[PDB]
Design an enzyme around this catalytic site. Sequence first.
Site: not given
Length: 129
Positions: A35, A46, A48, A50, A52, A59, A101
């Site tokens: 990661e 990313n 979009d 966003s 990380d 995110n 979640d």
Amino acid sequence: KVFGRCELAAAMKRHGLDNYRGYSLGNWVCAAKFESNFNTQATNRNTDGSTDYGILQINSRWWCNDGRTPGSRNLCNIPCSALLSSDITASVNCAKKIVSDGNGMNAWVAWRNRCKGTDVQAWIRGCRL
């Protein structure tokens, strides 16, 4: 900070992540390796828009505020920057939420594609745990 394979294993354990929601300690060291290469200062943008953040690459579209991702829910109630410090406490804490979640560790594309179903125990061999 760039953690040692073993040093991080140790720390995540101390932080109650060994078997959290049924994922062995190894599942976690593994996800983290691929990661972020055990580097907590890591970031990646990313498409979009966003970004990380951290050792576990959480995110900003959902978990944390970095103040330039708009759709932004800050479910972790942490500024993203926090997730980058050398104490991984905030990252664990938040990572716990992410994983509880619904999709378990599938939430981590890296874990899913390179960790899932490999004998992840190999990541905590050698370790005084």
